[PDB]
C-alpha cells in the first residue's frame, strides 16, 4: 500500500494552509483514496479507476495525459509553470480543483468528499505516518 | 496519579463551616475520580485523610449494602455539596483515639447514602502548609493594606487641608471630618474594637470575611 | 510548674540563628524551671521542665560544676533575655530537636542541650493558630473602619469640590476611594509580597503588638 | 532554536496514543517549551532552567543525570530498558511524569500546563514542520 | 511478626562506620518487617518494624516515591548483605533514641531512610548481649582447661622419652615442662593488656563470631 | 563519694540465696556510702547511697536501735565470704525497683535492713557487664593460641625423637599428635554443650570471676 | 629549672595553714612538679604537659586560658577577687583544686599526689631555698 | 620583736644540714630564745641575761667581747675566719656550741634544749616568717 501528502491553498481560505493525503496501491490510476484536513476537522472521498478513465474521456486527453496531470497537480510534483488553484466548500463536501496555466481557469478535478467524524484519529494516524517515515528516512 | 496531585489543589481550596450534634467542625475537601483529600478540625486539633480508588470501592461496598457501584461514580457523588453558599444533609461525628470518624447520611434517589470517614491527626508539615504559613502571611498582607489606607487617608487630608486653608467652605455643616491620626486609631481600636473583632468562636467570622485572602495566599 | 505555661502563653515570639538554621520560639523562666516553644515553621517542638533535670543535664557535660538549679535558669534567663550573646548550634533527629547553646558565663565554659519533643497539638492551638486567626480578623476590621473613614473624607472634599464651588491647586487632588478596585490592585500588585513568610522575620517585626495584645485577650 | 518529538501513552487513555513535542534553545537544560496533543485539542507549557535546576536539587541528583532522564524520557531517546509513564488530567491542567522500572514506580517530574485557543493552529504548525524536514532529508 | 525477633537472635555482629562514628548491630529481614539491634558499646538500641511503618515513613523521605512495602526491605537487606558478609551512611543520636541515617542509591536514583531506634529493651540486652557472651567465656575456660590437661599429657610423654628411654634430643626443640599457673600469670602480665582490647568491636567480630553463634543458637 | 563506683568496678561478682530467686552482684563500701549492682540473669539493678539516707531509713526500719553511719556501712562489710560465712535474706520485685531485705544478729541481737534498687543504666551495664566480658572472650582466645603453639612445640620435641627413635617405656602413655582443628571440632560437639552453662552464673564466678578481676582494673 | 610557692587553706584543716611549692621548666605548661606539706609530713606529684592540654581540652578552655587560671590558682597569682578553694584527703591523695565564685562552686582541676618517704629532707630543701633567696634578695 | 636565722653543720650529722633560729627583744644580751630544727622534730631552749653575764664570767671575757663572739657564733655574722661547730645530743639535750680555730677545741657557749610537742607548728611558723620576710624585702 502506497501514499503521499502535501499542502495547498484553498481559495476559500488563503489564510489557513490545508493539507492533503492521497493513498493508492501500485499506480496512482489503479484507483485511490483522498483526505483533506484543516487541523481540526477532516474530510475524505473515494475515487475508482473507472471515474478517472471517465474524466480522461470527459476532458479529451489520453488516459496517460490526464494521469501525468494528477501526477503533478496533486502529488506535489507540479512544475515551475503549472499554476494550480484548489477548491473546497464544506457546505458542499464537493471538492473540485481548478487547474490554471494562463488567463484564466480551466479546472480538471471534481468528486464527493464526505466528512469523517473523528478528525482526531486521522490527525494522529497521519502523524504516526510521518513519524515512522522520518525515522525510516534518517535510516 | 501521583495522588498528591490532589493535595495541591486542595489548597487552592478554602475552608468552611459545618454543624453537628455535639460539635460544628471546619474543613476543606478535594475530589477527583482518583480519590480525595480531606482536612478537618474543631479549633483544638487537626485531622486529615487522603484516599485512593481501591479503599473507596471496598469500604464503600461495606457500609452500603443497598447499592454497589464503580469507584469514579462514588467520588463524583461526594462533590455534590456546597455548604449553603438549602438541601438534604445528615451529619454526625465521633472521636476515637486521635483519628475521628465522620458519619454521613443523605438521600440519592430514595436509597440514602452512608459513609465512614477516617481522619487521623494532620502531620505537622501540613498544619504548617494549610494552616500556619498562609495565616501569618494573611496577617502581614493585611498590615500592608492598613498602611496603604493610612497613606491614601493622609492624601485626602492634604486635599481638604489645601481646601480649608484656601477659600472653600461646607454646604452641609456636618461632613466636616477629623484631620487624621494613625496612633490614636490603633489605640481607640485596641480598647474599643479589639476585644470583639478578634473572636475565634466557631470559625464562622473567618470563612465569611477572609476567604478570598486565604486562597490568594495559598495559590501564590 | 503550671504557671510556667501561663507566662509562656504571655510571651511574644522572636528570631534566632544557629549554624545556618534559624528557628523561632517563645519561653518563660522562674526559679522552679522553664517552658519552651521552638519551631521551624513546619513542625513545632516543646519542652517544659523543673529543677531535677536542670541539675541533672546541668551536670552531664559540665562535670566539675555544682550549683543550685535556680542559678542555671537565671543564667540562661540573662542569655536569652537579650538575645531577643554567646553562640548556638542545632541538631535534628527523631521526633526531637536538640538545641545546643554554647556560652562562657564569667570565665569557665558552660553550655546546655535543650531536649525538644514534637509540640502538643492543643498547644499549637493555644499559642499558634487561634491567636493568629484573631490577628487576621482584627486586621480586617481595621481595613473596614479605614474604608468608612476614607469614604468619610471623600464626603468632606466631595462637599468642598462641588457644593463650595471652589477648585484646587490640583497637586493634592486625590481619587474617589473604591474599596473593591483597591482590593484587586493590592491583590495583584502588593499581595505577592505583603504575605511573605520567608523566615518568620516580617512577623516578629510588624505584628508582636497585635499578637501580644490578642493572646492576653 | 531546536525541536524534537515523541509518541507516548498517557495512562488515562491507553487507546488514544497521544503525542509530545519539546522545543528548546541550545541544550534542553537551557529551559524548554513543551506541548502535548490528542488531535482535537492542544495543551502547552513552560519550564525555565530555574525549575529544572530546582527539581534537580529536590531529587538529590547531579543537575545532569536528571536532564539525561529528561532526554530518554522527554526526547524518546529512552534506553530500551527504562519504562516511563506520563499522565495528565484535563480537568486538572497538571502534567505529571512518572519514571518507572520494576515498580515501585519511583518518579521524576511534573508541571502545570494549559490549553491554547487554537489547537488547530498548532497542529498545522507542526505538520508544516515535519513536512519541511523529511523534505530537507530527501534533499540532503 | 514474632518470627522476625526469632531470626534476629540468630544473626551475629559485625562492623560499620558513618560520620566516622562506628556502630555495630544485628538485623533480620523478611517480607513484612525487620528486627534491628544496634549498639555503640555503652548503650543499646533497637527497632522492630512491620509493613505499616515501612509504607508510611518510606514516602516521607521521598515525597513522591510511592512503592510496595515488601520491596523496600528487599533492597535494604540486599546492601547490608554485601557490606557485612555503593552506598553512603551517617549517624546521629539524642535523648533516648538513635537516629540512623541511610543515604544510599538504588540504581541511578537516590534513596533515603531514617532508623528511629530507642534504648534497647532490658530483656533483649539480656538475650542478645550478655548470656551468650558469658557462655563464650565459660566455654573458653573449658578450652584452656582441656588444652591444659593435654599439655600435661604430652609432658608425661616427652618425660618418658627423656628419662626412661634414656635418650637425648637435639636441644633446639627442647621445651620446658608446662606450668599452667606460671603460664596464666606470665600471660596476664605480658599479653593481657591488649588481647582483650575491644577496639571498635572489630577485634570481636572477626575473631569470635563463630563462637558467638556456637552459643547463642544453643 | 563517686570513687566508690571506681572500687565497685574493681570488686568481683558472686552468688547468693533467696526464696523466690537467687542473684548475682558486686558491691563496694566506705565510711561515706555504698555502691551496689545485682542481677537475676535477665535484668540488672543498682544503688548508690550517702550518709543522710543511711541514717534516716536506718532508723526507720530499726525501731530498736540508733547508730552512726561508719559502723553501719562497716557492718554490711561483714557480709562474710560469698558462701558460706556461718543471716537471713529476702527478695521482692516491684516497679523498676528491686527491694532486698536483710536480717542479721550482731551480738545475739537481731538487725533489720532493706535495699532500694532501680534498673541499672545501660552505660553501667556496658562498664561492668559487657565490655569486660567481651575482653575476657578475646583474651581467652589468645591463651588458647599460645597453648596450641606450646602443644605443637612439645610435639616437635617428641617428633625429634620419633624419627631417630628411642622407643619410649610404658608404650601406651604417649598421647596422639596435636591437631588444632580436629580438637576444636570434637570440643564443639562433645564438650561445648555444657561448657557454656548459663545455669545461674554460679559456674562463672569462680575461674571466670577471677579472670574478670584480672580484666576490670585494666 | 624554676620555682614559686604559696600558702593555702586546705578545706579539711582550715586552721592549720598548709603550704604549696610548684616547680617547672620554662612555661608552667611545659609540665610541672607539685608539693604540699604541713610541716611534719610531705606530699608530691607530677603533672606533665600532656595532662595540661588534656584537662584544658576536658574543660573546653583554650590551652592558654587554662594556663592563666593555673597561674592564678597554684602560683598565688590570684587577683584580689576570685575565691579559689582547695581540697585534699590525706587518705585518698586525690587533691582537687576547685574554684568558688558568686554562690556557684565548680572546680578547675584535680591530681594524684604521692607520699614522699623523707618529709624532712624536702623541708630542709625548701627552707634552704628561702635562705639563699632572701640573702640574694637583700643582695639586689 | 626581733629575730634571725642561719644554718650550722651539726657534728653528729655532717650530711644533714640543721637550722638555727634566735629571737630577742633589743640587744642579744637582753636575753634570748633559741630554736634548733632538723626538719621533722624541733628543740627549744631559753638563755637568760643572767646566764649571759654568768658564762661571760666563767670564761672571763668582758660582756662586750663574749657578746661579739655570739654575734659571730649564733647569728651567722661569722668573720670569714672563725670556725664554729655545734653539738647536740637528742638523748641528753645538752647543746654546746664550741669555737674551733688553730687545731684545738675551744668551746664557749652551752645550753639545754628539749624536744617540743608540735614540731609541725614550729616549722609552719618559720616558713611563715620567711614568707613575710622575703615579701618585705622585695617591697623594701
Curated annotation (Swiss-Prot), chain A:
One GO CC annotation, please? DNA ligase IV complex
UniProt-reported outcome of changing residue 4 to E: Abolished interaction with NHEJ1/XLF
Result of mutating residue 62 to R?
Answer: Does not affect interaction with NHEJ1/XLF
Annotated effect of mutating residue 106 to E: Abolished interaction with NHEJ1/XLF
Q: For this protein, what is any one GO molecular function term?
A: identical protein binding
Q: What is the effect of changing residue 71 to E?
A: Abolished interaction with NHEJ1/XLF
Where does the entry say this protein is expressed, by tissue? Widely expressed.
Q: What is the effect of changing residue 58 to R?
A: Abolished interaction with NHEJ1/XLF
Q: Which residues carry this modification: Phosphoserine?
A: 53
Among the record's GO biological process terms, what is one? cellular response to lithium ion
Keywords attached to this entry: Chromosome, Coiled coil, Cytoplasm, Disease variant, DNA damage, DNA recombination, DNA repair, DNA-binding, Dwarfism, Isopeptide bond, Nucleus, Phosphoprotein, Ubl conjugation
Q: Where in the cell is it found?
A: Nucleus; Chromosome
User: What PTMs does it carry?
Assistant: Phosphorylations by PRKDC at the C-terminus of XRCC4 and NHEJ1/XLF are highly redundant and regulate ability of the XRCC4-NHEJ1/XLF subcomplex to bridge DNA. Phosphorylation by PRKDC does not prevent interaction with NHEJ1/XLF but disrupts ability to bridge DNA and promotes detachment from DNA.
Annotated effect of mutating residue 82 to E = In SSMED; impaired ability to repair DNA double-strand breaks
Segment Interaction with IFFO1: which positions?
1-139
Describe the family membership recorded for this protein in Swiss-Prot or TrEMBL: Belongs to the XRCC4-XLF family. XRCC4 subfamily.
Q: Could you say which disease the record links this protein to?
A: Short stature, microcephaly, and endocrine dysfunction: A disease characterized by short stature and microcephaly apparent at birth, progressive postnatal growth failure, and endocrine dysfunction. In affected adults endocrine features include hypergonadotropic hypogonadism, multinodular goiter, and diabetes mellitus. Variable features observed in some patients are progressive ataxia, and lymphopenia or borderline leukopenia.
The protein's name: DNA repair protein XRCC4
| Origin species | Homo sapiens (Human)
Q: State which stretch of the full-length protein is shown.
A: 1 to 139 of 336
Curated annotation (Swiss-Prot), chain B:
UniProt-reported outcome of changing residue 111 to A: Impaired ability to repair double-strand breaks (DSBs). Abolished ability to bridge DNA. Some studies show lack of interaction with XRCC4 while another shows that this mutant retains the ability to interact with XRCC4
User: What does the PTM comment of the record read?
Assistant: Phosphorylated by PRKDC at the C-terminus in response to DNA damage. Phosphorylations by PRKDC at the C-terminus of XRCC4 and NHEJ1/XLF are highly redundant and regulate ability of the XRCC4-NHEJ1/XLF subcomplex to bridge DNA. Phosphorylation does not prevent interaction with XRCC4 but disrupts ability to bridge DNA and promotes detachment from DNA.
Q: Which domain of life is it from?
A: Eukaryota
Recorded consequence of changing residue 191 to A: Does not affect ability to repair double-strand breaks (DSBs). Does not affect interaction with XRCC4
Q: What is the effect of changing residue 199 to A?
A: In 6A mutant; abolished phosphorylation; does not affect ability to repair double-strand breaks (DSBs), possibly because of redundancy with XRCC4 phosphorylation sites
Q: What is the effect of changing residue 39 to A?
A: Does not affect ability to participate in V(D)J recombination
**Annotated segments matching region Globular head:** 3-131
Impact reported for residue 66 to E: Abolished ability to repair double-strand breaks (DSBs). Abolished interaction with XRCC4. Abolished ability to participate in V(D)J recombination
> What coarse category fits the chief subcellular location reported for this protein?
nucleus
Q: What happens after mutating residue 63 to E?
A: Does not affect ability to participate in V(D)J recombination
Q: What is the effect of changing residue 107 to K?
A: Does not affect interaction with XRCC4
Task: List, in alphabetical order, the Gene Ontology terms for molecular function in this entry.
Answer: DNA end binding; DNA polymerase binding
Tell me where in this chain the PTM Phosphoserine is found: 128, 199
Q: Which UniProt keywords apply?
A: Chromosomal rearrangement, Chromosome, Coiled coil, Disease variant, DNA damage, DNA repair, DNA-binding, Nucleus, Phosphoprotein, SCID
User: GO cellular component terms?
Assistant: DNA ligase IV complex; DNA-dependent protein kinase-DNA ligase 4 complex; fibrillar center; nonhomologous end joining complex; nucleoplasm; nucleus; site of double-strand break
Describe the effect of residue 42 to A/P: Does not affect ability to participate in V(D)J recombination
Notes concerning its domains = The coiled-coil region mediates homodimerization.
Q: What is this protein called?
A: Non-homologous end-joining factor 1
Swiss-Prot record, chains D, G, H:
Q: Which residues carry this modification: Phosphoserine?
A: 53
- Report the subcellular localization: Nucleus; Chromosome
- Tissue-level expression: Widely expressed.
UniProt region (Interaction with IFFO1), positions on chain: 1-140
Q: How is it modified after translation?
A: Phosphorylations by PRKDC at the C-terminus of XRCC4 and NHEJ1/XLF are highly redundant and regulate ability of the XRCC4-NHEJ1/XLF subcomplex to bridge DNA. Phosphorylation by PRKDC does not prevent interaction with NHEJ1/XLF but disrupts ability to bridge DNA and promotes detachment from DNA.
Name the reported effect of residue 140 to R.
No change in sumoylation
Phenotype upon changing residue 58 to R:
Abolished interaction with NHEJ1/XLF
Effect ascribed to mutating residue 65 to E: Strongly decreased interaction with NHEJ1/XLF. Abolished interaction with NHEJ1/XLF. Abolished ability to bridge DNA. Abolished interaction with NHEJ1/XLF
Q: Which family does it belong to?
A: Belongs to the XRCC4-XLF family. XRCC4 subfamily.
Instruction: Provide the disease association from the record.
Output: Short stature, microcephaly, and endocrine dysfunction: A disease characterized by short stature and microcephaly apparent at birth, progressive postnatal growth failure, and endocrine dysfunction. In affected adults endocrine features include hypergonadotropic hypogonadism, multinodular goiter, and diabetes mellitus. Variable features observed in some patients are progressive ataxia, and lymphopenia or borderline leukopenia.
List the protein's name.
Answer: DNA repair protein XRCC4
Of the intact sequence, the residues represented are 1 to 140 of 336
